[PDB]
Design a protein around this ligand. Sequence first.
Ligand SMILES: *C(=O)[C@@H](NC(=O)Cc1ccccc1)[C@@H]1N[C@@H](C(=O)O)C(C)(C)S1
Length: 257
Amino acid sequence: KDDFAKLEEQFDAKLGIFALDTGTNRTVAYRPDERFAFASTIKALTVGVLLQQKSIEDLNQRITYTRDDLVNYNPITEKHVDTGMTLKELADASLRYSDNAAQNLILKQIGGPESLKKELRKIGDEVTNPERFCPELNEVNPGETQDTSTARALVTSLRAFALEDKLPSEKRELLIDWMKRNTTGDALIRAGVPDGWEVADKTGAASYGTRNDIAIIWPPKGDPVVLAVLSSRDKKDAKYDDKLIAEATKVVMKALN
Ligand SMILES: *C(=O)[C@@H](NC(=O)Cc1ccccc1)[C@@H]1N[C@@H](C(=O)O)C(C)(C)S1
């Protein structure tokens, strides 16, 4: 409690923390219901919904696109404009590289932010507010609730898809594999977790120094932890520091042990 305030003190930032130990039902909450721009963590839920709406076979559908559908951070999708990419390959790119264009293509496919919100409401997430495609292209100003969620809701919806019954097991397995194989999170939740332990995570970064990671974390032996660490700062062009996330993860891990 004061460890998390210490981190807020040390990094001049606001933290939102929610963790669930699914083995004991122990919880670690710190501003659990405070809203942050969810930023690219929404990609994990976007794929959950894609997977609910498609057989694994249907993920082989090819999606074509041009250079004009690519804006900022498209490491995978910029390599394939000639051929396009299948839904499967877009999911991989979106989750493991946070390919922004891949995300936009998947979001279109599922019916846009309106359909994403519909499906999240259906799983009992009253908080996550998808509003815009690309939502990184627009600022979430303090007090704005469009494209925001909370640590607690993000954990709840992530557990629903990844760990519970919102997906049949072969699709839940695909989601988990992609997340475990994320390339973008080494300095975040993964840097705060004990060595060896498996981590499936999805990162995000926006304006106002927003720096997020959501994860499922497995102990050698036992049930997983599901965790959201959301952060933001006072100023629109504020810098973030990944260390804040890693260190907040350390505190959660302490508290769970
Ligand atoms: C979603 O979070 C994406 N963010 C952006 O495109 C905007 C942005 C804002 C500030 C700094 C950098 C980028 C992509 N996801 C993150 C992430 O997964 O950490 C990237 C920084 C890779 S871009």
